[PDB]
């Protein structure tokens, strides 16, 4: 298990003097969804490129924490599911528009359901069971990235989580609990005058997985005094 965030102070949506659209748009409707595909190229050793087909791209570059992963997954029919940016995203092809991502790859064959587990989410503004709801995958081991995107693409779309200017909420995180192992992510931007999408999303780059069932979700919030 990874220890809670009080010795790991969070970010504050106000001590970010950038803009909040640079965040809400990563957890807005658009994303990289794809089923059963094999990397067709590789630019950097920790990368794979997928040709797959809304509006500004088509070839996806997936980035991992390791030189491995790229291996493993290079040439496997997989699913790809994560956030994705274009701003700070270049890469060459060898296959005589471009989007980028991190992690988000699970193996397709032998991971499907019928049958589509719903994971419940408990939201805690201030510290109070102030909302809930479920998200739904259709697969055995799911990427936390994938999970987190969902939980987010709800909150935003109903409880203003992300605005453009700053945030309603001071801090906020998303905890993931399996049986003997829990862990969290910080929903809040890097402190300063402007915010790095690639830096941020680079948290996933490890490709962390849960398991459709054994997993609950807890989203903790606070407000700006």
């Amino acid at each position, epitope marked *: 298990s990874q220890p809670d965030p009080k010795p790991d102070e969070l970010h504050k949506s106000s001590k970010f003097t950038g803009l909040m659209e640079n965040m809400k748009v990563l957890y807005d409707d658009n994303h990289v969804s794809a089923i059963n595909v094999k990397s067709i190229d590789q630019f*950097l*050793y*920790f990368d794979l490129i997928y040709s797959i087909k809304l509006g500004n791209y088509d070839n996806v570059r997936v980035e991992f924490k390791n*030189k*491995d992963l*790229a*291996d*493993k997954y*290079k040439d496997k029919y997989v699913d790809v599911f994560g956030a994705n940016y274009y701003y700070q995203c270049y890469f060459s092809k*060898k296959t005589n528009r471009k989007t980028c991502m991190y992690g988000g790859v699970t193996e397709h064959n032998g991971n499907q359901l019928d049958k589509y587990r719903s994971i419940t989410v408990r939201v805690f503004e201030d510290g109070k069971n102030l909302l809930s709801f479920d998200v739904q995958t259709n697969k055995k081991k799911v990427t936390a990235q994938e999970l987190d995107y969902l939980t987010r693409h709800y909150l935003v779309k109903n409880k203003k989580l992300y605005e453009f200017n700053n945030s309603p909420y001071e801090t906020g995180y998303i905890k993931f609990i399996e049986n003997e192992n829990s862990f969290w992510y910080d929903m809040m931007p890097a402190p300063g005058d402007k915010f790095d999408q690639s830096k941020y999303l680079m948290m996933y780059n490890d490709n962390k997985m849960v398991d459709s069932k054994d997993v609950k979700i807890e989203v903790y919030l606070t407000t700006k005094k």
Partner: antibody
Amino acid sequence: DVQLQESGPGLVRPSQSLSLTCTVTGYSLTSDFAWNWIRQFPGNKLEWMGYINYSGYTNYNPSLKSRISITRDTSKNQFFLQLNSVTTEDTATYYCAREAYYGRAYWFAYWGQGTLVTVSA
Amino acid sequence: ENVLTQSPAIMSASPGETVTMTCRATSSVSSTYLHWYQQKSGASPKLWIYSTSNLASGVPARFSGSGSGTSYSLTISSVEAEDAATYYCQQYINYPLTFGGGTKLELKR
């Protein structure tokens, strides 16, 4: 400690294959790192061939993907290289090396003695 | 793919002289993924600097490495005769992984 032993037929005929062995010692082929074939030509230029990795996974110099095989016998703990349709431009010294890494930093720590291969009729 | 380019091929030096070889990449690496190997003739290469500046096991700190972007250098302060060798920079990251074509180092007499 981790040594690396090349071997193979000193001479291949144009168009044959070229199976080579690296025999590892002091370290298990399956605990970590990549295991690479690199060959150096006359005039010394060094070309990477590719590596069988720590979990039996490959990645090849695309300049050869098609004629290139890197496989392993974990039970004799050694790795191998197969080279197709060799042409004389394949005469070279062959090293097999395992890597080390800090962070995103991968390099080649240990190298084998080498192993000349004349490709000739 | 991302060819790495070494200047000069050969370079003489009298023992005590301090000298510098270069490594010009196309593309352009971060300093971390930029290694040098040393090869004394009749022998395998061997790591010398990794991540550009960082000496390997038992290499005399006469050796140093600066570089960045697409320009990188390898320096030997007082140059002993046991320094005669060929030196290869090497980039990771790129795929395919690349070597530059030696700088040979010979002694003056």
